[PDB]
Symmetry: D3
Subunit: 71 residues, 6 copies
């Protein structure tokens, strides 16, 4: 979904994405299309921020890379 | 927004209803939210995939409707 | 997701209003979203504990109301 | 403090209360205190808008003044 | 309320529960009973994914075995 | 104002804030005024619980103290 993703960053426990207001459930639904397969344990969207976590055998950086590879 | 997100627009005697793709309601409802009472929009409230928008006094539902299609 | 999540059903001239347990609105609304304009539902919107639903053309609010009752049973 | 409420207006079907970003569910939780007692049939809130309708017998004008003589 | 829960899994940061579309808030409300009496620090729900986290002194695997308890 | 924010706590991954029912998005809105270079990485809000996580550089406690110097 084009330029709705305003920013993608991360840290020790989660990969955080910021979107235009109200776009979070939209972009987050995209990640859930791949989800577990790629190594996304889960994703939760608020209004303009998304939190997603990698599985075991995957670290946040591996997540941060595949996500880029998506958008 | 994007129209591949808006799946259907329709109306009755009280509100104009917009259906969208799962998760898109809030995104699309913010567009209508840019139109004020003067345009005939009293309000707009979105759920997960449906939006209920209602006419401001002085505009009938058909009014709000043709206006929304114009907006799109 | 028993209908014990549904606390009350009633209407007026524009919409049919349902009151559910807190946090059960979206879930109960999905059910109604399985009906469609053909059974007379123009649309359905859920908050946290309340749901507003409204009838399509040629359907009065009372018709939507009786369809919901039978939709839940 | 109710500096979060921006406007209450009406029409033949509902009463709209525009709210600051996010304050919609909080302010709306206020309207659920009134119930069918004070003529409320129900209220749904979004992110910054609330729709509310009068119970049987009450008109929207009545419901409007309730929310005014209550807010 | 039974089949509303599709999957429960975890990693080094949170336990994530996947549920039916729209049941996130209801199920996450079930978790909100346990409180910090258990190992829970917080639980946040979206539409179909639930992110919960362990409080100081508990591991994420603790919170996990305990949530299966609850369910 | 008054009892809107019921608690702020933390663990290994995020700072958890509990609020009054439906107050989460509002409280979260304040948290989003601060970000990245100011400590915060992202803030998600459910209905009464909030999860906030530190920008990759800060300790969850750095972020925590900053949030305290508000509530
Ligand atoms: N219908 C939807 N909005 N789906 C998107 C879900 C995104 C994410 N799993 C969440 O629950 O927050
Ligand atoms: N208009 C609002 N709800 N603003 C608050 C957003 C809070 C947080 N960024 C979230 O996405 O959950
Ligand atoms: N994934 C869901 N929550 N689905 C139910 C949607 C309920 C209703 N149509 C709404 O948009 O508010
Ligand atoms: N936890 C809450 N936000 N409660 C307030 C409910 C507001 C309104 N009845 C709705 O269903 O949208
Ligand atoms: N940032 C947003 N999600 N804005 C959309 C709000 C849409 C509509 N006024 C509502 O309150 O439900
Ligand atoms: N009335 C409710 N929706 N209760 C459930 C809240 C679930 C979760 N603690 C959240 O705040 O996201
Ligand atoms: Pb960045
Ligand atoms: Pb991992
Ligand atoms: Pb009709
Ligand atoms: Pb029948």
């Amino acid at each position: 979904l084009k330029n709705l993703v305003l920013d993608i960053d991360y840290n020790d426990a989660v990969v955080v994405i910021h979107t235009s207001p109200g776009a979070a459930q939209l972009i987050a639904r995209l990640l859930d299309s791949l989800g577990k397969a790629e190594g996304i344990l889960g994703t939760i969207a608020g209004d303009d921020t998304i939190f997603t976590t990698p599985a075991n055998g995957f670290t946040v950086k591996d997540l941060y890379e595949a996500i880029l590879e998506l958008f």
